[PDB]
Enzyme design. Structure first.
Site, PDB file in Angstrom:
ATOM      1  N   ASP A  54      48.723  37.894  58.650  1.00 60.11           N
ATOM      2  CA  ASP A  54      49.592  39.068  58.644  1.00 60.11           C
ATOM      3  C   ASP A  54      50.461  39.148  59.897  1.00 60.11           C
ATOM      4  O   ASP A  54      51.673  39.371  59.811  1.00 60.11           O
ATOM      5  CB  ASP A  54      48.768  40.338  58.514  1.00 60.11           C
ATOM      6  CG  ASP A  54      49.636  41.576  58.530  1.00 60.11           C
ATOM      7  OD1 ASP A  54      50.380  41.776  57.553  1.00 60.11           O
ATOM      8  OD2 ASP A  54      49.606  42.321  59.530  1.00 60.11           O
ATOM      9  N   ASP A  57      47.068  38.422  64.269  1.00 65.47           N
ATOM     10  CA  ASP A  57      45.671  38.309  63.876  1.00 65.47           C
ATOM     11  C   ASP A  57      45.566  37.308  62.732  1.00 65.47           C
ATOM     12  O   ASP A  57      46.534  36.617  62.401  1.00 65.47           O
ATOM     13  CB  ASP A  57      45.123  39.680  63.482  1.00 65.47           C
ATOM     14  CG  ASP A  57      45.835  40.264  62.263  1.00 65.47           C
ATOM     15  OD1 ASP A  57      46.912  39.739  61.889  1.00 65.47           O
ATOM     16  OD2 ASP A  57      45.305  41.239  61.674  1.00 65.47           O
ATOM     17  N   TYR A 206      46.317  48.841  56.562  1.00 66.17           N
ATOM     18  CA  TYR A 206      47.455  48.955  55.656  1.00 66.17           C
ATOM     19  C   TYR A 206      47.143  49.961  54.552  1.00 66.17           C
ATOM     20  O   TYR A 206      47.243  49.681  53.358  1.00 66.17           O
ATOM     21  CB  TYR A 206      47.848  47.589  55.103  1.00 66.17           C
ATOM     22  CG  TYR A 206      48.594  46.766  56.130  1.00 66.17           C
ATOM     23  CD1 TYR A 206      49.939  47.006  56.387  1.00 66.17           C
ATOM     24  CD2 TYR A 206      47.952  45.767  56.861  1.00 66.17           C
ATOM     25  CE1 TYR A 206      50.633  46.267  57.334  1.00 66.17           C
ATOM     26  CE2 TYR A 206      48.636  45.025  57.810  1.00 66.17           C
ATOM     27  CZ  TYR A 206      49.979  45.279  58.042  1.00 66.17           C
ATOM     28  OH  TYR A 206      50.670  44.551  58.986  1.00 66.17           O
ATOM     29  N   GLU A 423      54.346  43.463  69.274  1.00 64.52           N
ATOM     30  CA  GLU A 423      53.707  43.091  68.022  1.00 64.52           C
ATOM     31  C   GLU A 423      54.674  42.276  67.174  1.00 64.52           C
ATOM     32  O   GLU A 423      55.887  42.509  67.191  1.00 64.52           O
ATOM     33  CB  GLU A 423      53.247  44.334  67.257  1.00 64.52           C
ATOM     34  CG  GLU A 423      52.832  44.082  65.796  1.00 64.52           C
ATOM     35  CD  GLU A 423      51.527  43.277  65.625  1.00 64.52           C
ATOM     36  OE1 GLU A 423      51.249  42.332  66.413  1.00 64.52           O
ATOM     37  OE2 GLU A 423      50.774  43.592  64.673  1.00 64.52           O
TER      38      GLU A 423
END
Ligand SMILES: OC[C@H]1O[C@@H](O)[C@H](O)[C@@H](O)[C@@H]1O
Ligand SMILES: OC[C@H]1O[C@@H](O)[C@H](O)[C@@H](O)[C@@H]1O
Ligand SMILES: [Ca+2]
Ligand SMILES: [Ca+2]
Ligand SMILES: [Cl-]
Ligand code: NA
Length: 614
Positions: A54, A57, A206, A423
Site C-alpha cells: 500500500d 508498509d 482504510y 508519507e
C-alpha cells in the site's frame, strides 16, 4: 528546473514498480527490489502472491489498491496517446497488469474476494525491507456470508476499466478481466455491506467512511463503458437514487480511495448530460477552484498562501492531485467557461507540487529541484537495525513517489518520521500519474524519457564479519567475530552463511608440527559450528577454519537479527612456542576492537559474497 514530463511519467510508473510484492521478473528495472511476500495466502491454501504494497508498509490493502488500479486505467483510457508518445504505454500496461493479475488471484470464486494480506499492527510494528519480513501475514476475505460492496464494487471498476485499455494488445486478457468484473459487481450488488465490517482490521487503516453506495455506481458505470450494454448504464443510474436528494449530494471533498462519487458522477455526466451530475460535478470543482456561488456567498476550499488547494493534513498533495484530475477530465469534455477555469486550476495545482511553491522544491522523490530525500518507506530506506534513523540516509531512491506535502501554511519537513510531510502511497500517485500524462500532452512536446533508467547502483557491503582479537600468545589466537547480513541490493534472508579464517602454518612446519597439532574450538557461540583446520594451499601451508551458521536465520531486520556472534580459539599444544599469527591471512589489520575485515571471506550456501581468500 527544466521539466521533462516523459521522464516524470516514467518515474511515476517506476514508483509502482517499487511497490511490487511477490515474485519479481528477471528483467525488473529496480535492482534493489527482490522476491517478497512469497507465502501470502499460504495460511488459507491459496496463491495470493503479487500485487502492490500500500505505502511505506507491506500490507496489501484491497480497497485503495482497487482504487489505484482503476484510476491508473482511467488515465490510460483518457490519454492513451500521451502515454504512447511519451514512450510509457508499455510500462503503464505492465504496471496495471501487476495489480489486476493480483485481483484475478484474489477473486477466487464469484462471490469470494481476498481483500487484505498482512495484519496492520503486525506489519507496522517492524521497520525493515520487504524482502526479509519476519512476521506472519494473515489473509482476510469478504464473501457472500460477510460481504463488502465497496471492495467488490471498486475492484470490479478496476477490472472493467483495465479491460478496456488492454483490449488492443491482449484481447483474451481483456475478456478475462471483463468476466471477473461482471462477477464481482454482482457480488457487490446482491450482498450488501461495508467491507470493513468483515475485514475488521481494515477499520483502523482504510475504514469505509463513505459506505458502499458510491462504489456500486462506480462499478456499474465502468461496466457500461467496458461493454456498452445498456443494462449497466441503467444499473448505474438506478443506483444513484440511493444517493438521496441531488441538492444534498456532497461536494466539499474530492475523488479518493474511499469516495468515488466524484469519479462516478463525472463519468455519468459525460454519458448522460443529466443536470444532476453536471451540477454536482461543477459544485465540487467550483468549491475547489474559484469558489462555489450560493447566489449569496462564495464557498471555497482553503488555499495555502503559496497557492495549494488544501483539503486536510494527510496526503494534501494527493487530494489536490485528485481534484486536478477531475478538473482535467471535465475540462476536456465540457464546452463552457468552466473548462478554462478548471484547466487552469489543474495546471497550477500540478505546477505547485512539481516545484512552484514556497519551499522551492519538487515534492516528487527523485525528480526536479531538491526533491524529498527521506520518504516514509521501509524498503527504500533499507534499515538493517529495525530503526528509522539507521541508516541516516536512504539506501535507494524511490523515484516517482508523490509525498504527502505541506501543511495549510506551506510548511514542510523532509524527515522520515514526519508522516504528514513524507508519507507515500499507491493512492497518492494514482490520479497524479494521469495528471503527468496530461501535462505531457499539454507541455511535453519533444520530451523523451531516460534510456535504460535507472542505472544499477553499486551495493554497499552486505554480508561481512566484524572481528577482533580476544588475546594471542605464543601458542594460540582467540578471535571474536560477528557475522553480519546488512543486505539491501536487494535485502535477502540468509540461513546458510559461513566464513573462513585463514592461517599460515609455515612456522609450525618449521618447528616440526603440522595442522594436525592445531585444535580449533568454539567458546561463546550463537549457533555456529567451528571446523578443524582444512588446507587452502598445501604447498604454502595455508589452512582455514570454516565457521558455519547453517540453519540460523540472519537478516537485515533488527539489532539482533542482522548479526550472530561466535568466539573461537586456534591452539597449538600447550607449552609450545612456535605459533605466529602475524603471517596469518585473516589476522591482518585486526585489533582488539570489533571491526569489519575483508580478510575473513563470507559465504552464503557455499557462494562467496564478500571478502578475499589468500
Ligand atoms: O494510513 C491509513 C490511511 O488513512 C487515510 C489516508 O487518506 C490514507 O492516505 C492512509 O493510507
Ligand atoms: O452543512 C452543509 C449543509 O448546508 C446547507 O446549506 C445545505 O442545504 C445542506 O444540504 C448541507 O447539509
Ligand atoms: Ca465508498
Ligand atoms: Ca602463522
Ligand atoms: Cl532483532
Ligand atoms: Na539524505
Amino acid at each position: 528546473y527544466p521539466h521533462n514530463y516523459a521522464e516524470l511519467l516514467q518515474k511515476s510508473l517506476l514508483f509502482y514498480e517499487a511497490q511490487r510484492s511477490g515474485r519479481l521478473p528477471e528483467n525488473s528495472r529496480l535492482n534493489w527490489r527482490g522476491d517478497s511476500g512469497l507465502e501470502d495466502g499460504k495460511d488459507v491454501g491459496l496463491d495470493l502472491t503479487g500485487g502492490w504494497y500500500d505505502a511505506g508498509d507491506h500490507v496489501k490493502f484491497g480497497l485503495p489498491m482497487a482504487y489505484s488500479a482503476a484510476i491508473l486505467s482511467w488515465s490510460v483510457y483518457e490519454y492513451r496517446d500521451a502515454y504512447k508518445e511519451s514512450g510509457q504505454l508499455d510500462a503503464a500496461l505492465d504496471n496495471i497488469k501487476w495489480a489486476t493479475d493480483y485481483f484475478l488471484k484474489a477473486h477466487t470464486a464469484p462471490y469470494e474476494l481476498w481483500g487484505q494480506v498482512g495484519n496492520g499492527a503486525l506489519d507496522h510494528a517492524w521497520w525493515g525491507p520487504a524482502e526479509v519480513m519476519p512476521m506472519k501475514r494473515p489473509a482476510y476475505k469478504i464473501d457472500a456470508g460477510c460481504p463488502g460492496s465497496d471492495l467488490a464494487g471498486g475492484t470490479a471498476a478496476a477490472l472493467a476499466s483495465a479491460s478496456i485499455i488492454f483490449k488492443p494488445t491482449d484481447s483474451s486478457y481483456s475478456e478475462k478481466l471483463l468476466a471477473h468484473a461482471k462477477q464481482l459487481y454482482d457480488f457487490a450488488d446482491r450482498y450488501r455491506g461495508k467491507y470493513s465490517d468483515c475485514i475488521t482490521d481494515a477499520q483502523q487503516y482504510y475504514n469505509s467512511w463513505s459506505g458502499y453506495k458510491d462504489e456500486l455506481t462506480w462499478g456499474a458505470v465502468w461496466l457500461y463503458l467496458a461493454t456498452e450494454e445498456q443494462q449497466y448504464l441503467d444499473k448505474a443510474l438506478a443506483s444513484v437514487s440511493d444517493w438521496g436528494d441531488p441538492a444534498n449530494w456532497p461536494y466539499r471533498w474530492t475523488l479518493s480511495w474511499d469516495d468515488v462519487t466524484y469519479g462516478a458522477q463525472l463519468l455519468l455526466a459525460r454519458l448522460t448530460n443529466d443536470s444532476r451530475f453536471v451540477k454536482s460535478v461543477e459544485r465540487n470543482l467550483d468549491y475547489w477552484s474559484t469558489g462555489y456561488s450560493h447566489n449569496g456567498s462564495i464557498e471555497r476550499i482553503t488555499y495555502t498562501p503559496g497557492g495549494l488547494a488544501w483539503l486536510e493534513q494527510w496526503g494534501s498533495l494527493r487530494y489536490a492531485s485528485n481534484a486536478a484530475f477531475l478538473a482535467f477530465v471535465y475540462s476536456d469534455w465540457v464546452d463552457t467557461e468552466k473548462a478554462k477555469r478548471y484547466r487552469d486550476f489543474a495546471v497550477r495545482q500540478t505546477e505547485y507540487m512539481l516545484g512552484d511553491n514556497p519551499q522551492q522544491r519538487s515534492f516528487v522523490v527523485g525528480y526536479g529541484k531538491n526533491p524529498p530525500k527521506h520518504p516514509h518507506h521501509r524498503t527504500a530506506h533499507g534499515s538493517w537495525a529495525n530503526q528509522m534513523n539507521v541508516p541516516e540516509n536512504h539506501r535507494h531512491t524511490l523515484y516517482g513517489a508523490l509525498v504527502g506535502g505541506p501543511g495549510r501554511d506551506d510548511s514542510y519537513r523532509d524527515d522520515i518520521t514526519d508522516y504528514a510531510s513524507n508519507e507515500v502511497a499507491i493512492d497518492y500517485n494514482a490520479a497524479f500519474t494521469g495528471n503527468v500524462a496530461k501535462m505531457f500532452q499539454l507541455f511535453g512536446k519533444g520530451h523523451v524519457p531516460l534510456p535504460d533508467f535507472p542505472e544499477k547502483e553499486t551495493p554497499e557491503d552486505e554480508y561481512f564479519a566484524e572481528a577482533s582479537i580476544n588475546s594471542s600468545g605464543n601458542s594460540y589466537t582467540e578471535i571474536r567475530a560477528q557475522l553480519n547480513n546488512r543486505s539491501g541490493w536487494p535485502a535477502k534472508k540468509t540461513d546458510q552463511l559461513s566464513f573462513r579464517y585463514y592461517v599460515d602454518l609455515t612456522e609450525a612446519v618449521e618447528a616440526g608440527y603440522s595442522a594436525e597439532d592445531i585444535k580449533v574450538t568454539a567458546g561463546y557461540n550463537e549457533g555456529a559450528s567451528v571446523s578443524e583446520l582444512k588446507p587452502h594451499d598445501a604447498s604454502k601451508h595455508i589452512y582455514y577454519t570454516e565457521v558455519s551458521f547453517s540453519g540460523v536465520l540472519i537478516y537485515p531486520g533488527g539489532q539482533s537479527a542482522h548479526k550472530k556472534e561466535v568466539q573461537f580459539r586456534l591452539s597449538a599444544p600447550d607449552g609450545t612456542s612456535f605459533w605466529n599469527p602475524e603471517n596469518d591471512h585473516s589476522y591482518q589489520g585486526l585489533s582488539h576492537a570489533l571491526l569489519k575485515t575483508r580478510y575473513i571471506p563470507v559465504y552464503d550456501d557455499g557462494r562467496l559474497v564478500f571478502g578475499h581468500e589468500p
